[PDB]
């Protein structure tokens with residue numbers, strides 16, 4: 001019942017992470033990095049509140065968290081930036097516009113992928129309910145391996161899909177359009193995965209250790 | 222309009238399928254894969270040009286899509302011809318590799334595992350021949366965001382191929398909830414194809430045949 005469409009969406013609503021303030025006393029990358037570390041903590045809490053997630057093997061839980069985190073953060077970023085072209089609302093005291101991305105090399109390229117994907121969600125008029133479904137799906141779909149408890153993950157992923165399909169249905173649009181909107185949303189996931197891969201590569205080409213800090217949190221989990 | 226109809230479209234993509242590519246071998250594993258990719262790219266252009274309406278996009282978009290997708294389309298091809306043989310990758314008729322051979326070159330094993338794992342999901346879903354034809358066109362048409370944010374034309378084309386896939390899934394006979402679930406399951410896999418594509422690109426650029434520059438030459442010739 002907790003995985004019933006309407007109930008599931010309300011449950012994901014309440015599970016939303018709080019606002020994160022970095023509280024600033026290289027530096028741009030310092031801030032982004034301090035932010036990620038803080039957001040990751042709340043991201044774990046968020047996942048655990050997704051009905052059934054805690055019931056997957058701890059193996060799958062850790063697996064999913066480890067490979068999704070960057071995507072989920074960027075999905076979050078895109079959603080709070082969605083109404084402001086040219087800008088990225090990373091956090092309540094960290095708003096960066098595109099050009100601030102020229103400072104650090106390699107980043108401008110990523111800002112442009114994030115801004116372009118956000119632009120696309122804006123054009124589709126992504127709803128609050130749809131966004132809650134898509135973000136859970138990003139988590140649940142982040143890793144193939146735990147799927148090829150696997151029974152449980154597949155069932156959970158189907159449940160969230162049903163909820164997204166349900167959300168699209170009460171849209172009142174025709175059945176052809178419903179299929180098209182589902183397809184348009186899911187194809188955007190490719191692009192969120194893409195920006196995620198670019199941001200990971202760049203983070204690792206860098207000389208705060210988010211990834212190791214994440215692994216500590218995961219061992220804590 | 223009618224040439225983009227679900228039935229005609231699937232048949233048109235069928236005929237547009239690239240030929241078998243023989244690498245014809247007289248570092249080495251990576252030499253082979255690289256010489257193969259280069260040969261496949263030529264035919265991939267031809268393939269794209271046969272997708273109804275592709276040629277009627279701006280040359281700028283045609284080049285954007287081709288440059289962004291090529292690795293994904295290649296890997297989509299790989300997964301499809303490997304789909305019935307777990308543990309193996311049929312790259313080409315004289316180049317079959319199994320997981321283990323991926324240990325030789327460093328970094329490659331991880332990619333093989335992503336490819337093999339994605340191929341296994343396509344096998345579990347029982348990907349159909351005409352579903353595969355639709356998905357691979359979608360991979361091309363959805364490879365780059367920028368050309369969409371002639372943009373009217375690309376969105377129309379992307380909708381036509383999607384309609385065709387939805388149509389393919391419909392005549393499957395299954396219920397309406399399952400049709401939605403199948404569409405969703407297929408498209409979520411695109412994320413994993415994109416992913417393997419990104420790992421394979423990164424690995425290719427960390428290397429010391431120049432596939433990407435050779436692609437840009439082909440792209441300039443396509444342009445001239």
Ligand SMILES: Oc1ccc([C@@H]2Oc3ccc(O)cc3[C@@H]3CC(F)(F)C[C@@H]32)cc1
Pocket residue numbers: 029032033035036039073074076077090107110111114198199200202203204206
């Ligand atoms: O809510 C958040 C969402 C995403 C992030 C990431 O932060 C870093 C940090 C170091 C690094 O090298 C790459 C990145 C990537 C790429 C990006 F576009 F700059 C932002 C990404 C952080 C918080």
Ligand SMILES: Oc1ccc([C@@H]2Oc3ccc(O)cc3[C@@H]3CC(F)(F)C[C@@H]32)cc1
Pocket residue numbers: 251254255257258261295296298299312329332333336420421422424425426428
């Ligand atoms: O049909 C084909 C499909 C994909 C390819 C690619 O070939 C190279 C070549 C050099 C390199 O550094 C990376 C890769 C990636 C990664 C991979 F898994 F090894 C195979 C990929 C080639 C032909």
